[PDB]
Amino acid sequence: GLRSTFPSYMAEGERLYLCGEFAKAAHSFSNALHLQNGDKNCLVARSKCFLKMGELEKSLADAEASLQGDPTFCKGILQKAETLYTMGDFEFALVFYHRGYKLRPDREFKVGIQKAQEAINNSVGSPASIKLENRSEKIVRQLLGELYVDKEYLEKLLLDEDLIRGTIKHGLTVEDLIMTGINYLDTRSNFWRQQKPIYARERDRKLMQEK
Amino acid sequence: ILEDQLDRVTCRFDIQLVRNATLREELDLLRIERNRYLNVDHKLQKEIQHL
Amino acid sequence: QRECISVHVGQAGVQIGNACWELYCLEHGIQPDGQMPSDDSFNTFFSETGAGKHVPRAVFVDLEPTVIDEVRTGTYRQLFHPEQLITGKEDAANNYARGHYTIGKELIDLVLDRIRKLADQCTGLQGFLIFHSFGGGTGSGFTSLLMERLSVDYGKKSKLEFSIYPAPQVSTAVVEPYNSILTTHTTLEHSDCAFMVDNEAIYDICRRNLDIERPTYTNLNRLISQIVSSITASLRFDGALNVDLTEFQTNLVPYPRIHFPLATYAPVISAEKAYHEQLSVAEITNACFEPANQMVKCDPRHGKYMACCLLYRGDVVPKDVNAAIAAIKTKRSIQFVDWCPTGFKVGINYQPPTVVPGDLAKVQRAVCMLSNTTAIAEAWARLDHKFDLMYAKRAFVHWYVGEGMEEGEFSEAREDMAALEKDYEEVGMDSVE
Amino acid sequence: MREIVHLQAGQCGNQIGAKFWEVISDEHGIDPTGTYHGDSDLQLERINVYYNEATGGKYVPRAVLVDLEPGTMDSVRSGPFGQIFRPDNFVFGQSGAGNNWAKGHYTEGAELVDSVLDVVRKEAESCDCLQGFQLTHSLGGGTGSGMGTLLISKIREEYPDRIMNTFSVVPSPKVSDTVVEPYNATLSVHQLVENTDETYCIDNEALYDICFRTLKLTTPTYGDLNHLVSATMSGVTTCLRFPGQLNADLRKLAVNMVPFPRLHFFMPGFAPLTSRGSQQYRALTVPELTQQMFDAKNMMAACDPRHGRYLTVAAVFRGRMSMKEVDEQMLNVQNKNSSYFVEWIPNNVKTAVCDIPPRGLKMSATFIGNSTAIQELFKRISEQFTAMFRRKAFLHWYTGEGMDEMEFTEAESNMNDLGNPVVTRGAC
Amino acid sequence: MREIVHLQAGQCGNQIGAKFWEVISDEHGIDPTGTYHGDSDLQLERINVYYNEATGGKYVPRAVLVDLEPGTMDSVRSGPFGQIFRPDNFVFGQSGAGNNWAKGHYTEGAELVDSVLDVVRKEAESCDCLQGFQLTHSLGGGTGSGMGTLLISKIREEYPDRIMNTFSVVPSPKVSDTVVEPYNATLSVHQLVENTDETYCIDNEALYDICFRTLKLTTPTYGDLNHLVSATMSGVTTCLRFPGQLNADLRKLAVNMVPFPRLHFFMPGFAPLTSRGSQQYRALTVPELTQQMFDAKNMMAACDPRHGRYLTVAAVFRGRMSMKEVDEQMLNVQNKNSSYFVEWIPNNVKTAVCDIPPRGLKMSATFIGNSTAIQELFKRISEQFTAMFRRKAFLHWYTGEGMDEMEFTEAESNMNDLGNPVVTRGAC
Amino acid sequence: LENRLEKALMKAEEAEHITNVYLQLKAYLQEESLHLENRLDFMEAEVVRTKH
Amino acid sequence: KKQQAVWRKKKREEMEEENRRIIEFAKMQQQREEDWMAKVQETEEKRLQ
Ligand SMILES: Nc1nc2c(ncn2[C@@H]2O[C@H](COP(=O)(O)OP(=O)(O)OP(=O)(O)O)[C@@H](O)[C@H]2O)c(=O)[nH]1
Ligand SMILES: Nc1nc2c(ncn2[C@@H]2O[C@H](COP(=O)(O)OP(=O)(O)O)[C@@H](O)[C@H]2O)c(=O)[nH]1
Ligand SMILES: Nc1nc2c(ncn2[C@@H]2O[C@H](COP(=O)(O)OP(=O)(O)O)[C@@H](O)[C@H]2O)c(=O)[nH]1
C-alpha cells in the first residue's frame, strides 16, 4: 500500500523534477494523487512534468483537472496556457494568459502574452498570404534548426536491424526509445511550423531582398 | 539583464550542441565496432549452420 | 608465476590496506620506497622493474580523494605506481545508488582498465583479494559495480574478499542497514568467499587480549591485515601442507551460496603478557574456537560449524596439529554437521608472523581459523530486521531513489536476503531419514 | 575536489559570516592582507575550498555579500579582516528594505538579485565540480528573509544538484527584534521548505543561555555571539578541508539526516566549551565531551529535546583521540536516553572524526541534531502569525508592496503542514 | 627587416598618436631625449619598425604629424615626449578647417596635401621593404576626416601594394561633438571603403563603459582613453617587432580577417584590464583573459556583438603562455558562442602569441573582430545623415565650398551599399 | 529580447531530451561491449566442438 | 632527479627576475608622471601668484 506521506512525495517529485528525472517525478506525483485525489498543486506539477517530457494531451488533462475546482487558480491557469501554447492553440493560450494576467499581474503571464502575440502576428499580421479558394528535406532542414543532424542520426539508428532488436529495462526496447525521441522531434517540428510558418519564412526574405 | 539572460540561454544551447556532437562520435565508434562484431557473428553462424 | 591482484575500494579498504601493504612489505624487506636491500617471495603480490623498484599490485580506488591523497603524500608515497591510486571527484555520500548507479560509472571504466593491465602482466592470476565495507557507500556501490564487472572478464579466476559487516549494537552510518542488504544481494551471485569481519568484535578483542585500553582503526586494521597475510602465505613462502586460493574455496563453501566464512587469529597476545603463556599448537587451536575470539559478534555456541580451514602459519610440527584437532572434536560444545564428518583443512607454511612495528607481539607459532559457522545467520537476521523497521515508513529512501535506483530494488533485495536465511536454516537441519 | 560558495544576506548574515571568515582565516593561516603565514603543510592542502587562488599567494575568499542598506558593507570593510574579499563581490543597493519580506522579494531586492546571482555565477563557474552554497541569514526581519528566499529559489533553479547549507537566526520566544517577525519567519520558512537541504536554526535566547550559564561571560557582545555560531559554522565542513578517518561531507550529512525531504531543520551545537576559569577544573576527554554535548544547554536553538524525540543526530568530531571512547559513548547515550530516540530508525548517531583540532583546543566536536523539538518553535511562531493575521495588522505594507491575503494563507497552511509530520513522527 | 609609416590627422589623431608614441617608446626603451637606454637585445633587435635614425642614438619616429591649425603641433611639442619627433615632420598650415569635410578634401587642406605627400615620400623611400601606412584620425569632424581621406586616397594611389591601417574614432550613439558628424562620418567612410585594408573603429561611449566599471576609474581623462587605444594599437603590431611562436603580421591579419574586399571595418579590444583596487585580487590566466576578451564589454566600439553574428576573430597574445591552454580556450569560446559565429566559415579563429608582453604586465591579449554588429553603427549614422539631409540642413557650407547634391547622394548610396552585405551575411 | 529569450529557452529545452536519449543509447552500447567477446569466444568453442 | 631539480630552480629564478623587472618599470613610470605633475602644478601656482 501507500507507505509515506503526501508532502514527502511532493518534495520528492519536486527534487526529481529539478534533477531532470521526469518519469520518476511523474510517478511520485501520481503516488501523491493516490494519497489525495484532486490536489491542484500536485496536478499542476504532474502537468509540468508531462509538459517537459512531451505527453501534451495528459498535460492538458491535468491542467483542467487542476482548474475545474478553482477557475481563479493562477498556477493552473499558467500551466494550461503554457500547454495550449506548445500544443499550438496560440489563441487559447493568449486568452488564458490574459485571464491569468488580469487575476494577478505576474511576469510569467505577461511573457506568455507576448509569446502568443508574436506567434499570432507572425502567421497573420495584416497583408499576409493572399489565399486560394481551391478546396521534405529542406522543409525540415529549416524547421528543425541545427537539430537536423540529430534528426538524421536518429533515422540512421532506425535503418539498422540490430538497433531495432534491444533489451533496455524490462520492456523499453531501444526501438521504442528511438521512437520516443524521433516522435518528440516530429511534434517539435510541427510546433515550429505552427509558430513560424514557411510562408512567413519567405516573407522574411521578401521583406528583405527588395529592401 | 534581458540581454545577459539571452546570452546565457544561447551559450547553454551551444555547449549542449557540441557535447551532443561528442556523443554522436562516441555512438558512431560503438556502432562500427559492434557492426564488425555482427559480421563475425553472422559468419560463424553460417558455418555452424552448414556443419 | 603465482600472483594475486589486491583491490581496496573505499575508506575502509584504503585504510586497512595502508596496513595490509605495510605488513606485506615488512614481510620481505622492500624499504618504503621500492628498493629491496638484499627471492620469489615477491611475485605473489609485488612486481619488479629493473631499477630495484618492487612495485605493488593494488588499485586503491575511492570515489572521493582525501582518503587516497594521504597514501599519495605519505611514507609509502612511492611504492604504489602514481596511477594505481584511482581517486575521483565527490563522495558516494553513503548511497548504494551513488556508487553503483550515478557518480560511479564515470570511474568504473578506469578502475577496470588498471585491473586489465595488472592482469595482462601476471603469469598466474590465482585470485583477486578485494576489500570493501558491506555497510557504506563506495564500499557497497562501487564494489557491486566492480565485483560484477570482474566476472564479465576474469570469470573463472576466483575473487576472495574482506568486509566490515554492519556491527550489531554500534554502527555509525544511519543508512548502513540499507546499503548492506542491497550489497549482499549482488555479491552473493558473484564473489567466491566473503570473510566478513565486524568492528565491535575486533574492538573488544583489542581490550581483552592486547591490553589496548582505547583501540582505534589502525589497531583494528592491523589484525585484519595479518589475517590476509595468513591466507596468503602458501602462494608465497613455502612450508609442508600448502593451500592455494582454489583450495580455501573447494573446502569451505559447501553449496553454491553459503560462502560467508568467519575468521580469527590465535596468538593475539599483547607483548607484555606472552612472557607468561606457552602459546603452543594446542592453546592456539583451542583459543581459535573460543566464543569470544571470533571476529564477528556471533555466538558459534549456538550454531553448527559446517566446515573449517585452520591455516597454521609458522613453525608447527605437523603431528601436534592432528593432536589439537582430535582434542577439539571430542569437546561437545563445538558441534559440527550431520553432512560433513571430516573435520577441517590442516595447512602449514613455515614463516613466523611478521611484527609490523606496532602492538601484537611475536610468537614462533600462529593459526588463522577461517570457519563457515551456521550462526552468521544471527547477524544476518539482525540487519534484516533493521532493514525491516526502515523499509516500513519509507525512511531515508528519497535519497537513494533520486540517485538512479528503483524502490523495486530495495524490495527485491529483501526477498533475496530472506532466502539466504532459509538456506542457512535448511543447511543446518539434520537428515536422520 | 570540493568547494563551497559562501553567500551572506542581511546585516545579521553579513556579520555572522564575516566572523566565520575570521574564524577560518585563523584556522587556515590567512592574515588580513590575504597572504599566507602558517606552520603546517596540511594547511594549504585544501585551502581552495573557501579561498580562491590569486597572483602572489594572496588568497581571496569565495564569498558574496548582499544587503539593500549600504552601511553594513562599510562595517564589513572597516572590520579587522575587511580587506580580504573581492571588491566586486560587495553587491549593494541604494534602497531600504524596511524589514519587509515583500520589499525583499517583490521590489528593489528582486531587481538586485539579477546582479548578486551573476557574481555567484562567476564564483561558481571558476571552479571544478561544485558541492554546495552556504547562505547566512536571519528569518526574522527583511533582506535576510526577503532577498534570502529569492536567492534561495533562483539558485536552486539554477543548480539543482547542490547542497545549500543555509544557517538561519530564528526569532526568540521571550524577546524579539523586528515587529513583523512572525510574518517574515513563517513566510520565509515556507520558501525554505521546498528548496534547501540543510537549514540550521540558531536562536538568540539559547545563545545567551550558553553565554551566561556555560561560558560565564560578564558582558557578552555580538562579536562573541557570532563567534559561537561561526564556530559551529566552521565545525561541519572540516572533513572536506582536513584529512582523517570517517570523513563526512554535505551530502554525507544530508542523506544521513534527512529521512523525509521536508524535515531538514537541524539543531547545532559546538561543545568542547568551558569558562575561562573552569578549564583548570574541567577534564577534557571523549566521555566528558559527549556528556557536555548531548545535554540540552549546549543547544544553539531554544527548543528542548525533552519535549520531543530525536530522529537522527550527527557529531562531527575534530582532534587526535581514540574512537572506542566515542563508540562506547554514542551507544551509552542511546541506551541511557532510549525513550527520546525514535524506534523506526535504529542506531541513529553519526561519528565524523576529523584529525586536525581547532587552534587553542585539543578536542572539539560539533553537534547537529534533528529533533521533534522544532515543533515548539514552529507552533509558537504560527500562533503569533495567526494572532497578527486574524486582525489583519501590520499588513497593508505587504498588500501595497504587491501581495494578497491568499499567499499568506498558503504560507501558513504549508507551515501547519510542516507542523503535522513532526508530531506524527513523535507519535509514530 | 620591416617598417610601418605613421600618419596623424586631426586633433584627435595627433593626441592619440602622441600617446601611441609614448607607449611604444616606453616599450622600445627610448627616453624623452631620444637616446636608447635599453636593457634587452630583443628590444633593439627590431627597433627599426617605427623609428628612423640619426647620430648619437637619437632614434626618431617615422611619424609625420599633420593638422590644419598650428596649435595642436605646439601642444604635442610641449608634451612630455615632445622632443622626439623630427621637427620638419610637423606639417602645419596657418588656417583652420572648421570641422568642414569640404575644407579639408577640396579646399585649404588640398594645398597642404602636396607637402604632406612630399614628406611621406621622404620617410617611405628611406626603407628596404615596407608593409604600409597606419593613420590615426577622427571619423567625424574636419582635418582628420577632411585632409584624412584625401591623404588616404593619394598614398593608396601612389603606393598601391601596401597595407593601410586606419585607426578611426567614430561618433557615439548617445552624444556628438560636432553637428555635422553624420556628414563627416558618411563622407569619410565613403572614401575609407574602397581604399583601406584594415579600418579599426573605436567609440568613445564604449571607451567610457570600459573605463568606468571595468577599470573602476572616477575622473577619466582623454589621456586614459587614448591610453586604451594605444594599448590595442601597440598590441596589433606585435609580431613585426617582438619574437614568438605563431607570428602574425599586418598582411596575415588582413588575409585572415578580410574575407571580402569591402568587409574590412573591425572592432578591436584589449583586455587584461584590472582596476587598481582589484589588481591584487586578480587571477591572471588565459581563461580569464579569453572570458574578459569575448564578454561584450571590452570591445572599444559601441556595437553590441550579440545583435550580430561574428565573421572572424583574431587574438594576438603578448607574453609567455602555453598555446595548449590558449588554443583550447579559443576552441571553448568558439563553441561557447556558436550561433554568434558564421557557420559558412568553419574554424574562424586566428591566434598569435609573441614572447614579450607589454612591459609592466605579465600576459596580454589584443582582440580584433570582424563582426556583423557594425550594421547598427553604420545604420545609425545613415539615419542621422538622412534626417539631416532630407531638410537640406548644414549643407550650404559644403555646396559653397565646392560640392553638389550628387556627392552626398552617392555617399549615402555607398553607406547603404555596404549596409546590405553586413546584414546579408548574418543569415547565410 | 523577451521573445528571443523564450524562443531560445524552449530550443534548449528540446536539446536536453536529445541528450537524455543519447546517454541511454550509449549505456546500451557500452553494456553490449562487455558481453561481446566472451560470447564470440564461446561461438568459436562451438565451432571447434562441431569440427571434432 | 638532480638535474630536474636544478632546472626547475633556474625557472623559478628567472620568474623572480621578471617580477623585479615589471615592478621597477612601474616605479619609473610613477616617477615620470609625478615629475610631469610637479611641473604642471608649479606653473599653475606661479600663475595664480
Ligand atoms: N579498518 C577500518 N574500518 C573502517 C575505516 N573507516 C570506516 N570503516 C568501517 O566502514 C564503515 C563506514 O565506512 P565506509 O563503509 O568504508 O565508507 P566508504 O566505503 O569509504 O564510503 P564513502 O564514505 O562514501 O567514501 C564503518 O562502519 C566502519 O566500520 C577505517 O578507516 N579502517
Ligand atoms: N549571532 C548574531 N546575530 C545577530 C547579529 N546581529 C543581528 N543578529 C540577529 O539578526 C536579527 C535581525 O536581523 P535583520 O534586522 O532582519 O537584518 P537584515 O536582514 O539586514 O534586515 C535579530 O533577531 C538578531 O538576533 C550578530 O552580530 N550576531
Ligand atoms: N581617444 C581620444 N579621442 C579624442 C581625443 N581628442 C579628441 N578625441 C575625439 O575626437 C572627436 C572630435 O575631434 P575633431 O572635432 O574631429 O578634431 P578636429 O579634427 O581637429 O576637428 C571627439 O568625438 C573626441 O571623442 C583624444 O585625446 N583621445
PDB file of C-alpha atoms in Angstrom, chain C residues 31-106:
ATOM      1  CA  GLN C  31      62.031  -0.494   2.285  1.00  0.00           C
ATOM      2  CA  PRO C  32      59.109   2.063   1.909  1.00  0.00           C
ATOM      3  CA  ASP C  33      60.470   3.296  -1.467  1.00  0.00           C
ATOM      4  CA  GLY C  34      60.802   0.147  -3.578  1.00  0.00           C
ATOM      5  CA  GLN C  35      64.433  -0.981  -3.195  1.00  0.00           C
ATOM      6  CA  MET C  36      64.988  -4.393  -1.507  1.00  0.00           C
ATOM      7  CA  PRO C  37      68.425  -4.165   0.294  1.00  0.00           C
ATOM      8  CA  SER C  38      69.462  -7.835  -0.098  1.00  0.00           C
ATOM      9  CA  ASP C  39      63.533 -14.251  -3.633  1.00  0.00           C
ATOM     10  CA  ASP C  40      60.327 -15.435  -5.404  1.00  0.00           C
ATOM     11  CA  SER C  41      58.557 -14.249  -2.204  1.00  0.00           C
ATOM     12  CA  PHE C  42      57.755 -11.076  -4.216  1.00  0.00           C
ATOM     13  CA  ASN C  43      55.885 -12.064  -7.407  1.00  0.00           C
ATOM     14  CA  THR C  44      52.952 -13.145  -5.213  1.00  0.00           C
ATOM     15  CA  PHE C  45      51.995  -9.513  -4.628  1.00  0.00           C
ATOM     16  CA  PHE C  46      54.868  -7.275  -5.825  1.00  0.00           C
ATOM     17  CA  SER C  47      56.165  -6.759  -9.408  1.00  0.00           C
ATOM     18  CA  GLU C  48      59.792  -5.789 -10.273  1.00  0.00           C
ATOM     19  CA  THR C  49      61.104  -3.136 -12.691  1.00  0.00           C
ATOM     20  CA  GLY C  50      64.833  -3.325 -13.475  1.00  0.00           C
ATOM     21  CA  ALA C  51      65.572  -0.497 -11.021  1.00  0.00           C
ATOM     22  CA  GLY C  52      65.062  -2.201  -7.647  1.00  0.00           C
ATOM     23  CA  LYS C  53      61.589  -0.619  -7.623  1.00  0.00           C
ATOM     24  CA  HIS C  54      59.464  -3.524  -6.294  1.00  0.00           C
ATOM     25  CA  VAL C  55      56.078  -2.034  -7.410  1.00  0.00           C
ATOM     26  CA  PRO C  56      52.840  -3.164  -5.571  1.00  0.00           C
ATOM     27  CA  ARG C  57      49.725  -4.645  -7.158  1.00  0.00           C
ATOM     28  CA  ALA C  58      46.642  -2.717  -5.913  1.00  0.00           C
ATOM     29  CA  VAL C  59      44.005  -0.346  -7.382  1.00  0.00           C
ATOM     30  CA  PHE C  60      43.334   1.645  -4.139  1.00  0.00           C
ATOM     31  CA  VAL C  61      40.148   3.236  -5.604  1.00  0.00           C
ATOM     32  CA  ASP C  62      37.757   5.681  -3.839  1.00  0.00           C
ATOM     33  CA  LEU C  63      35.024   7.841  -5.414  1.00  0.00           C
ATOM     34  CA  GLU C  64      36.351  10.726  -3.240  1.00  0.00           C
ATOM     35  CA  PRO C  65      40.025  11.971  -2.798  1.00  0.00           C
ATOM     36  CA  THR C  66      41.227  12.673   0.778  1.00  0.00           C
ATOM     37  CA  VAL C  67      41.471   9.031   1.948  1.00  0.00           C
ATOM     38  CA  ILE C  68      43.727   8.186  -1.073  1.00  0.00           C
ATOM     39  CA  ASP C  69      45.522  11.588  -1.056  1.00  0.00           C
ATOM     40  CA  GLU C  70      47.127  10.618   2.272  1.00  0.00           C
ATOM     41  CA  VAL C  71      48.664   7.413   0.806  1.00  0.00           C
ATOM     42  CA  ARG C  72      49.971   9.546  -2.114  1.00  0.00           C
ATOM     43  CA  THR C  73      51.704  12.005   0.260  1.00  0.00           C
ATOM     44  CA  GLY C  74      52.735   9.513   2.977  1.00  0.00           C
ATOM     45  CA  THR C  75      55.772   7.352   3.802  1.00  0.00           C
ATOM     46  CA  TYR C  76      54.580   4.964   1.085  1.00  0.00           C
ATOM     47  CA  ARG C  77      54.370   7.914  -1.343  1.00  0.00           C
ATOM     48  CA  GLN C  78      56.365   5.885  -3.904  1.00  0.00           C
ATOM     49  CA  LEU C  79      55.523   2.141  -3.920  1.00  0.00           C
ATOM     50  CA  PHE C  80      52.006   2.477  -5.440  1.00  0.00           C
ATOM     51  CA  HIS C  81      52.574   3.409  -9.116  1.00  0.00           C
ATOM     52  CA  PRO C  82      51.177   7.025  -9.335  1.00  0.00           C
ATOM     53  CA  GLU C  83      48.258   5.635 -11.440  1.00  0.00           C
ATOM     54  CA  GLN C  84      47.239   2.592  -9.308  1.00  0.00           C
ATOM     55  CA  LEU C  85      45.610   5.030  -6.817  1.00  0.00           C
ATOM     56  CA  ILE C  86      42.497   5.988  -8.892  1.00  0.00           C
ATOM     57  CA  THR C  87      40.679   8.787  -6.974  1.00  0.00           C
ATOM     58  CA  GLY C  88      37.632  10.673  -8.296  1.00  0.00           C
ATOM     59  CA  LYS C  89      35.733  13.914  -7.566  1.00  0.00           C
ATOM     60  CA  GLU C  90      32.857  13.926  -4.991  1.00  0.00           C
ATOM     61  CA  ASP C  91      31.944  11.156  -2.485  1.00  0.00           C
ATOM     62  CA  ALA C  92      29.301   8.376  -2.583  1.00  0.00           C
ATOM     63  CA  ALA C  93      27.647  10.133   0.400  1.00  0.00           C
ATOM     64  CA  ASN C  94      26.509   6.718   1.753  1.00  0.00           C
ATOM     65  CA  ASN C  95      24.193   5.866  -1.194  1.00  0.00           C
ATOM     66  CA  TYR C  96      24.365   2.384  -2.810  1.00  0.00           C
ATOM     67  CA  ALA C  97      22.990   4.118  -5.882  1.00  0.00           C
ATOM     68  CA  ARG C  98      25.540   6.979  -5.855  1.00  0.00           C
ATOM     69  CA  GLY C  99      28.357   4.401  -6.292  1.00  0.00           C
ATOM     70  CA  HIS C 100      26.518   1.614  -8.174  1.00  0.00           C
ATOM     71  CA  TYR C 101      24.439   3.924 -10.391  1.00  0.00           C
ATOM     72  CA  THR C 102      25.257   7.658 -10.525  1.00  0.00           C
ATOM     73  CA  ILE C 103      28.747   9.019  -9.684  1.00  0.00           C
ATOM     74  CA  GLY C 104      30.229   5.511 -10.120  1.00  0.00           C
ATOM     75  CA  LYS C 105      30.137   4.852 -13.867  1.00  0.00           C
ATOM     76  CA  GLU C 106      32.399   7.870 -14.537  1.00  0.00           C
TER      77      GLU C 106
END
